[PDB]
Amino acid sequence: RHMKRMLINATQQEELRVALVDGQRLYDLDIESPGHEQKKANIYKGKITRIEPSLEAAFVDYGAERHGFLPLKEIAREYFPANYSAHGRPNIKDVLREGQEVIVQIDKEERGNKGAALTTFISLAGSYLVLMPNNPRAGGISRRIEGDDRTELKEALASLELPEGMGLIVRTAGVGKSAEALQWDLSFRLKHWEAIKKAAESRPAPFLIHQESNVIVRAFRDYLRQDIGEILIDNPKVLELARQHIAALGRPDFSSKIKLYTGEIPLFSHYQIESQIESAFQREVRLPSGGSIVIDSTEALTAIRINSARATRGGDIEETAFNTNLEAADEIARQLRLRDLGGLIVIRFIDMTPVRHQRAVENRLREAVRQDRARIQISHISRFGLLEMSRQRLSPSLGESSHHVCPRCSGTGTVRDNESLSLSILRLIEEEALKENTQEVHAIVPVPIASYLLNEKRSAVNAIETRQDGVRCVIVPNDQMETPHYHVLRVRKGEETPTLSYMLPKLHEEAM
Amino acid sequence: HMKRMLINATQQEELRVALVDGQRLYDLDIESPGHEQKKANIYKGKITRIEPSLEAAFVDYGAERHGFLPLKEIAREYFPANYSAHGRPNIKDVLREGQEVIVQIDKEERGNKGAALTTFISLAGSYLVLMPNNPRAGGISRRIEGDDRTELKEALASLELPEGMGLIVRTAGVGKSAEALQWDLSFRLKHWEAIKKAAESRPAPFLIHQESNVIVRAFRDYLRQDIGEILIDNPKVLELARQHIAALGRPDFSSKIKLYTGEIPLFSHYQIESQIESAFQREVRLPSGGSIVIDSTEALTAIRINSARATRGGDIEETAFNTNLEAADEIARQLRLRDLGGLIVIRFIDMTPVRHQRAVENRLREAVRQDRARIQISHISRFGLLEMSRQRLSPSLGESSHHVCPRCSGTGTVRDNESLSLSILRLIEEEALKENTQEVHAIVPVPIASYLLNEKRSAVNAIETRQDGVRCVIVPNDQMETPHYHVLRVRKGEETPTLSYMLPKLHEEA
Ligand SMILES: [Mg+2]
Ligand SMILES: [Mg+2]
Ligand SMILES: [Zn+2]
């Protein structure tokens, strides 16, 4: 059939995968490996253990060690005694006791080894709006919004049955939103809040109430709407928790959609999204019409390039550039989700002379990324032909978590040419043979550099041995070295070792 | 402090040309040998045939195939003195067999055709193209619009350009002062005198100017008003250097072109060698403890800036705005040293004041002024990124002297071993589900099998105890690296007792 489904794959404890499919076409992928958890925005219930009116704070045990550091400015009124006497409100001894119990969120994990900074002022974020149910002060509309939008937005913002004593924030992605579309994302949030408290009195101790980092909860909260037919799961220990979670987000209606999968064929291959999860791992993703896009990664940005197909019987180059650039706005948008790419992205669309064809593509792109859960901001095609854009780094991308740095080229895509580099070494040797008190000079190098430096540049090496006389210049071949790597060590008179040339790598792997 | 040109022609495959203010490097070309080209070469050539049918003429410039000079391309100076235009002319009347002419090559040889010629000579410098033979030519490039095109048409019309001549101002000239343009012009002129002197000094077919030559290109592209000496470290080159500077009509400079006789090689005497190695580093240190990080890409080039190792104090607003002015300077240089072309993208440190953002854009626009290549520059945008474009004069440094890493094919990354086992491990579970099937064979890199058969041991057993009567063999292979693999299947009936370590050579041989 054709249906919006959510597929979860939890067989290998090494990787939990959450695909979201629309029919038979994969829309978004999410991946968790265990360890190395980011416990930011997590909510617990914990016990005060150490009052300290000198730091104006209180260590709190929540079930991790060390306690975690809670300042007084971050304490809501509900945790003060019956009545309060304002003498500045500054002493902790006057606000709370040891062994009290409090609901707590992480505001800074966990810089240093010091406990993690905490706040009783809880923030529950969404696609549209951030509900802080503990704090009437804080409330606003995102800075990015302006124009008639702010007036329209702030006129659809007050129209809301928002409980008295909570305060909420509208988000970048909230513009244009309808007056009852914003109560749709607000019921989601304060249903959560009732469940966070339900599970707060539920039991006493320190325990985890909301786990912001977790793939499923993140994927339940952002994508679980009623056009999702099923939520197929293949590991029953995971389906148990998948229910405990949706209980916790306060939405136990949808719990019914959570079927289980027992079929023999591995779940993703049955539903035939396994090929498309592998185009996540490519570089050159072919497009439906023989075009291609090409995704590169650099220190602090990410760059895509569009290529058309090889020109075919003299067609129209402008309706080909246009048609390819539309197809690539679709795919760049999908690929941003499959890779969980985060930071500034930059795109080189094919050039098109009309302003009507550029706005067509920038639109096709705003649309394609509209339902993208993460914040996305876009600019317009520039003087040079580049579109800049940004995407919120929630999670680690496939590069950070399923890839590592190339051993040979050390990041770059390249290795210096052999001759180019050989010469670089030839002078780097001489540079060290023309110092004073230099008995020998050793140069461990890839087998083809050694080969080049001692046949085609043999005369140049010999030339160094005669100019600065007495200086033995030893160039070693090595099985354990490829084209970008070399060592060039110097030896001092009296430091001479009667060592063989082929034994010098074993003697110097120490050095190294 | 004197600005010098160092040439380094000791090694047979690498002429290295550097430019140094004192011992500060600021330019460089690393030209490999071979690959000569004839276009734009200037010859003296006897006319040899005349063929009205084509409204042309043929010229023996001294190549095997005579060249093809059309009527459309004949300066009026070669016309017979007694000449009456009575309509567009036929060429009988204009040229005679045996006439000597100064010719330039404007298309090379196209199979069995011979090179098209012109007597409308053009002498391109870095910034200008003098044209001593048509005053009808002129004006400015069409890729300069704006207050950049009017700032030219002024410094252009303040140049002392003789009667009969013409002058195209080039793209690379945008930012240049009237004094550099006035200096480039006076060198195209002196060159045009030499040419006429040499064409009169010897009646012939010979070669007068070799536009493509490694030495000529180095004087055009870096021999500039304020260059004090040219220190060369090969007698042979030095004798060529002097011949070319005499034929460029600066025959008096020939004496500044000194030799170098040292045991310490030249660039290491001026202690520049470490700065030339900076041009192949991916990261470059900055004076005040920062860094820049240049990374190439299919379509553009991408620079990141990083601030000092640490900030002792918290005037974080004056450590950011300084590291970013250093970066303008070192990028501008570093663009020159690598001859980087195409689109570049810079990610400066974020500064909150727009007055600081224009400060940087301005430093950078001033520093790419002494570059011979036109460099347009945008504004630090809403996302902190300054876009900018530089002109392709040459394939770049990492284009000529670099190739594509083989581990990853350009990526920068290889897939982790846990991510890639689990993929293989699903493709085994596919093949092994089939009806046809009896065994299934994976041939995988040594550490992948180490992973599948140890951490994922139980998961392979499960693939076997389920699919009842199917074997899963995972064989390590020395011969096979970080990314590659094979997953092969065996229909029921056709096995061999072929052991598991001899199973690579079986299937390999198949
Ligand atoms: Mg995703
Ligand atoms: Mg060059
Ligand atoms: Zn590599």
Residue numbers in the entry:
A (entry chain A): -1 to 510
B (entry chain B): 0 to 509
Sentences from the study reporting this entry:
Ribonuclease E (RNase E) is a metal-dependent hydrolytic enzyme that cleaves polymeric ribonucleic acid internally and serves as a central element in RNA metabolism of diverse bacteria. The NTD of RNase E (1–529) is highly conserved and harbors the catalytic activity of the enzyme. RNase E forms a tetramer in which the protomers are arranged as a dimer of dimers and accommodate an RNA substrate at the active site formed by the interface of two subunits of the principal dimer unit. The catalytic site is located in a DNase I-like domain, where conserved acidic groups D303 and D346 coordinate the magnesium ions that assist in the hydrolytic attack of single-stranded RNA.
